[PDB]
């Protein structure tokens, strides 16, 4: 037994099939080990550990991994960084995120919180020790968290500090909503996403009811973002190498709270991108021919609540995003690196 909170350089593991030209497979082929063929978490009886997803170095180390992965894979034709114009080739590559694991070196270990209602902050009773995390797809996106895990029971909200309106709110759905996005073949940048309105409006109600429990039964309002750049104002994600920008006004505004068809969101495949890894912009080539389709699971929402509403009866929320660290936080919340003393 015995341990103390600390961090160390982690290493990764994946099922990266060799020869596969998919850029996540080739990055994990040369940078990760094959996953443990025989894991085993030694359950710790009557233990109580304190976690903190918002102050966790694991998400920082995962962040630099995805920065590096994206930095070797999808290379932009022209990168406008720091005021420079570093040009390149931009071969249309194969893109499809693979689950990645994070495993302690000898001398350290990860603790996993098995409390089904754990919100990512503070005490946890059902603690267990693991050598690796689990298969985590590094899906880069804003507004909506796609292709992740779901809450095991009720809807969990996650925030470093709910009263602080500047701290991001992560909503962990206990049930996914299918997002189906397509770019029909022969405007080649014209695309759309289909969401079944009955599913979405239902879980959006459950979210608003759970959100009500954490704001003194205040009226909960869902409005679209208060301006900014397109990466924040629209649900942005990457599908088969193409950067999709989808207008989600029909989701935080169609407050059907004669409306339960299939919501069709408008989308544009953008070339000039505002990077998430930092710095500035990236210019990619026009989309590949053929039908560009990706069907993903909506498993989380990145929310931000308006400030000066203390003296009112409403709490308005808008979809957030931009810091991919919160995206990794959405799956690494239950994990925590401890060194054995
Ligand atoms: C977390 C921030 C990142 N950052 C920014 O400047 N921006 C501003 C930019 C527009 O304002 C949008 C950036 C974004 O999230 N882009 C994006 C790109 C592709 C896809 Cl697929 C996606 F889902 C999102 C966020 C720099 C800084 C080092 N970091 C703190
Ligand atoms: C604690 O979590 C583990 C993980 O599956 C499992 O044994 C069970 O859900 C919990 N144990 C108890 C005794 O409740
Ligand atoms: C989407 O969600 C369903 C049910 O929640 C699940 O069975 C399925 O495996 C998920 N798909 C992916 C790609 O994770
Ligand atoms: C999800 O959690 C909500 C609580 O906000 C609950 O009302 C609902 O029944 C749950 N649904 C599932 C499928 O777990
Ligand atoms: C998270 O859970 C802890 C312990 O149950 C509680 O003290 C804290 O207020 C919760 N935070 C949020 C944002 O729900
Ligand atoms: C009122 O606003 C301040 C910031 O201006 C914030 O610190 C405080 O938490 C708010 N009141 C409540 C009850 O949250
Ligand atoms: C949470 O936010 C409020 C509002 O600014 C602040 O007064 C309070 O100190 C914060 N809590 C912590 C633990 O920092
Ligand atoms: C996704 O949309 C395309 C185009 O509308 C359609 O052909 C396909 O059947 C849809 N799939 C799902 C699972 O909704
Ligand atoms: C919110 O409203 C419900 C009514 O369904 C009530 O039972 C509950 O106590 C209220 N919560 C708070 C924190 O006032
Ligand atoms: C999204 O579409 C609505 C119309 O439904 C429009 O008013 C809004 O400006 C669009 N969003 C952006 C960021 O342009
Ligand atoms: C949706 O929000 C936009 C502002 O972004 C506004 O044009 C429109 O009136 C809203 N829709 C509804 C039904 O209120
Ligand atoms: C709308 O929902 C009702 C049940 O609430 C269902 O019977 C009806 O078929 C739905 N409408 C459409 C067009 O699917
Ligand atoms: C949406 O999903 C619900 C299941 O929650 C289903 O009953 C309904 O028929 C779906 N509507 C459409 C238009 O696909
Ligand atoms: C989500 O997973 C599905 C199935 O693996 C895949 O087709 C889709 O492209 C993924 N979505 C994103 C945004 O990576
Ligand atoms: Cl191993
Ligand atoms: Cl060019
Ligand atoms: Cl309103």
The domains of the chain, with CATH numbers, are: 4-339 (2.170.40.20)
Tell the burial category of 177 from Cβ atoms under 10 Å away from its Cβ (0-12, 13-18, 19+).
buried
CA dihedral angle for residue 170, residue 172, residue 176, residue 181, rounded to 10 degrees:
10
Paired strand residues for 100: 136
216 CA to centre of ligand 4 in angstroms: 20
Pocket residue to mutate for ligand 9, from 217, 218, 220, most atoms within 8 A of Cβ? 217
End-to-end CA distance of the chain: 8
- DSSP three-state, residue 73: coil
- DSSP three-state, residue 205: helix
Q: Could you say which ligand is closest to the alpha carbon of residue 307? A: 6
What lies within 8 Å, CB to CB, of 165 at 6+ separation is 304, 305, 306, 307
The upper half-sphere exposure of residue 8, i.e. CA atoms within 13 Å in the direction of its Cβ, equals 15
This PDB structure is determined at a resolution in Å of 2.7
**Residue corresponding to tokens 């309002």:** 221
CB atoms within 10 A of CB 30: 8
> What is the 8-class DSSP label of residue 141?
B
Residue 236 · residue 143 · CB < 8 Å: yes
The closest residue, in CA terms, to atom 2 on ligand 11 is 253
The closest residue, in CA terms, to atom 8 on ligand 14 is 294
Does any ligand 4 atom lie closer than 6 A to the CB of residue 189?
no
Ligand 3: atom nearest CA of 175 is 5
Does any ligand 5 atom lie closer than 6 A to the CB of residue 162?
yes
- Could you give the CA distance from residue 249 to residue 298 in angstroms, rounded to a whole number? 16
Does any ligand 1 atom lie closer than 6 A to the CB of residue 243?
yes
The closest residue, in CA terms, to atom 5 on ligand 11 is 224
> What is the 8-class DSSP label of residue 105?
P
Alpha helices in the chain (DSSP H): 23-31, 57-72, 197-213, 230-233, 324-332
């Amino acid at each position: 037994p015995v341990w103390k909170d600390a961090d160390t350089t982690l290493f990764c593991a994946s099922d990266a099939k060799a020869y596969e030209t998919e850029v996540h497979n080739v990055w994990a082929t040369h940078a990760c080990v094959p996953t443990d063929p025989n894991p085993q978490e030694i359950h710790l009886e009557n233990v109580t550990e304190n976690f903190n997803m918002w102050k966790n170095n694991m998400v920082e180390q995962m962040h630099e991994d995805i920065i590096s992965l994206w930095d070797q894979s999808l290379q932009p034709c022209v990168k406008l960084t720091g005021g420079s114009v570093i040009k390149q080739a931009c071969p249309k590559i194969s893109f499809d995120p693979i689950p990645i694991h994070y495993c302690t070196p000898a001398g350290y270990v990860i603790l996993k919180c098995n409390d089904k209602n754990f919100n990512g902050t503070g005490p946890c009773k059902n603690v267990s020790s693991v050598q690796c995390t689990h298969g985590i797809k590094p899906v880069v996106s804003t507004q909506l968290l796609l292709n992740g895990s779901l809450a095991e029971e009720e809807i969990i909200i996650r925030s470093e500090n709910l009263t602080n309106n500047a701290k991001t709110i992560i909503v962990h759905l206990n049930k996914s909503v299918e997002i189906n996005c397509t770019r029909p073949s022969n405007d080649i940048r014209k695309a759309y996403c289909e969401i079944n309105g009955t599913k979405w409006n239902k879980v959006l109600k459950q979210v608003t009811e759970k959100l009500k429990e954490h704001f003194n039964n205040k009226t909960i309002i869902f409005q679209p973002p208060s301006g900014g750049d397109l990466e924040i104002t629209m649900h942005t994600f990457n599908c088969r190498g193409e950067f999709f920008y989808c207008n989600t006004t029909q989701l935080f505004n169609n407050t059907c709270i004669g409306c339960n068809g299939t919501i069709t969101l408008p989308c544009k495949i953008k070339q000039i991108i505002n990077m998430w890894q930092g710095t500035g912009q990236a210019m990619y080539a026009p989309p590949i021919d053929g039908k560009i389709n990706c069907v993903s699971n909506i498993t989380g929402i990145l929310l931000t609540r308006d400030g000066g509403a203390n003296n009112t009866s409403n709490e308005t929320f808008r979809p957030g995003g931009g810091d991919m660290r919160d995206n990794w936080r959405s799956e690494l919340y239950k994990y925590k690196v401890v060194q054995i003393e």
